[PDB]
Each structure stands twice: as structure tokens, then as C-alpha cells.
């Protein structure tokens with residue numbers, strides 16, 4: 001039977017089932033006011049799938065100049081063509097190689113650049129913005145989006161959306177690396193998975209994907225969604241409550257000191273965007289500081305809602321295309337205020 005919603009994370013995470021249901025706000029606003037993230041499934045079925053394929057991005061935009069990042073070591077690959085990223089998205093033998101001769105795990109940095117998404121891709125902009133869930137919160141002019149309504153005493157988000165494109169992490173050593181390292185945003189965000197690639201060349205690495213989800217602390221009902229094999233898994237997220245951010249800073253100051261970093265007692269390891277919390281660090285956070293997070297597997301068509309101030313990290317299981325929009329809900333406007 002079709003149902004309005006379900007629970008993941010043992011009852012701690014709302015999962016809405018119908019992205020365009022006009023009654024979603026009633027269930028949503030009770031969880032959102034408590035500082036929880038929310039998942040909405042099925043957004044891919046609302047979109048024009050031919051607009052979100054890696055081959056179309058390569059054909060239409062392949063000649064633009066860009067920088068990439070090597071996810072394994074943070075090295076920057078400067079001033080290459082965007083087709084050099086897209087043509088290796090799914091075919092491993094076509095990826096740029098490190099000195100060791102291995103194909104690299106790459107992230108495409110700042111593309112489309114700054115606020116240029118709408119001008120560069122007007123048809124993609126329309127398809128995404130017209131199908132975002134919770135539209136009173138997420139649309140630029142929604143009644144519960146204060147972004148366009150606040151004075152300069154508040155940090156306002158840039159005009160979006162922003163596109164996040166990166167290969168999947170592959171090996172046992174890769175399990176300790178982030179696609180996006182631990183950080184926080186002063187605005188709310190909605191992040192939609194519009195394309196996932198489960199490919200070949202080295203296609204048979206489902207076994208390391210299982211171990212990553214399991215060691216990532218994913219719940220049995222998410223474990224049931226994985227092993228059902230109906231839907232495409234994309235990325236593993238860890239999100240933490242905004243109220244826990246300082247305890248996370250204390251853990252990362254102590255670890256930086258144990259690893260012989262030389263850091264002033266006040267420095268901000270979350271703002272630095274330099275850490276990924278692996279299984280060891282997540283267990284230490286829980287045991288030594290009392291802090292529990294949400295381990296979320298984002299499948300094709302899942303929209304993840306991230307509360308303002310909430311620290312969060314992302315680990316791609318396969319090659320992903322994500323598109324995110326920032327907004328300012330009344331529940332969380334304190335997080336962007338410039339005084340006290």
C-alpha cells in the first residue's frame with residue numbers, strides 16, 4: 001500500500017513518500033522545529049531524466065575550463081576541460097591517472113561557477129525548481145522562505161541552485177575519505193540526487209559498498225532498502241544536531257593535538273572543512289562526548305533536508321550528480337543572525 005511516510009534511523013528520521021503531496025508540511029514542521037534532518041523520496045519520477053545524464057553535460061558544456069580535486073589526497077587538478085571529468089564518470093578506463101597509474105576518484109569543483117546555474121542551464125533550472133518538495137520553504141519566493149525578506153543583520157544565501165558532481169569512492173582505504181568533508185552552513189538546504197551510476201570496467205565492487213554502509217552505522221530498515229535491490233544507492237551522509245557543533249569542535253581539537261597539529265586553542269576545525277569522521281572518530285564522538293548523529297543513505301531521487309548550523313559530511317558510494325538549493329526557514333533563522 002502507498003503510504004504518506006515512514007521512519008528511518010530507528011524512528012529518529014522522517015521519510016516522506018510523495019514529493020508533491022500538499023499535506024507534507026503538517027508532518028514536516030513538527031520534526032523540522034526540533035532540529036532534525038528530513039528525507040523525501042521519489043523526486044526523480046517528477047523530473048525529465050534526459051536532462052540529468054552525464055553524456056548530455058559532456059556534449060553541451062565539454063569545452064569549458066575547470067579545476068578538479070583528487071578526493072584521496074586533496075590535490076587540485078588545474079585548468080582542464082569539463083569533458084575530461086564527464087567522459088570518465090562511469091567508464092573507469094577513461095579517468096585521469098595518478099602517478100601510481102591508478103584511475104583517480106575526482107570531484108568537479110565549483111561548476112556551474114558561482115551563481116551561474118540559471119543562466120548556463122535555464123531548462124534544468126526550471127525542471128528542478130518546479131519539482132522541489134516542501135515548496136513554501138524551498139522556492140525562492142515561498143511564504144516560509146525568509147531569504148528575500150531579511151535585512152543585512154542576517155547572512156543571506158547566494159542565488160542557487162548549486163551542482164555537486166563527483167566519482168564514487170572504491171577501495172577499503174577509501175572508506176576513511178570524504179567526498180565533502182565535515183562542515184556547517186548558516187542557511188537551511190535541500191539536496192536532491194538526480195543521477196547515480198553503478199558501472200563497469202572495475203564493475204563488481206558491490207561487496208565494499210555493503211561494508212561501507214554497515215560500518216557507516218546505517219539502520220536495519222535502510223539495510224532492508226539496500227538488500228531489496230529495487231532502488232539506486234548514491235551516497236552515505238552523517239549529520240549532527242546544531243546543538244552538538246561545539247562538542248564536535250572539542251573532539252577535533254584533541255585529535256589534531258594527538259596527531260601533532262599545532263593549533264591555537266580557539267581555532268575552528270569545522271569551519272576549516274579539513275576532517276572526515278571515520279568509524280573510529282564517530283565511535284569516539286559517541287563514547288567520549290555523548291553525541292549521536294544520523295547515518296543517511298541518499299538513493300536516486302532522495303531529497304535530504306539539512307538544518308542550518310547542523311555539521312554534516314558526504315561519502316559517495318557510486319558516481320553522483322546532486323543539485324542543492326539554500327533557504328531560510330523561520331524555525332532556524334537564529335543561525336544566520338550577525339549579533340550576540
Ligand SMILES: O=C(Nc1ccccc1)Nc1cccnc1
Pocket residue numbers: 198206207209210226227229230231232233
Ligand atoms: O545496485 C543496487 N541497486 C540497484 C541497481 C540497479 C538498478 C536498481 C537498483 N544496490 C546495491 C546493493 C549492494 C551493493 N551496491 C549496490
Ligand SMILES: [Cl-]
Pocket residue numbers: 035242309331332
Ligand atoms: Cl536549531
Ligand SMILES: [Cl-]
Pocket residue numbers: 120121122123124125
Ligand atoms: Cl538547460
Ligand SMILES: [Cl-]
Pocket residue numbers: 025133134135136137
Ligand atoms: Cl510546503
Ligand SMILES: [Cl-]
Pocket residue numbers: 179180181273
Ligand atoms: Cl570537502
Ligand SMILES: [Mn+2]
Pocket residue numbers: 183184185312
Ligand atoms: Mn553543506
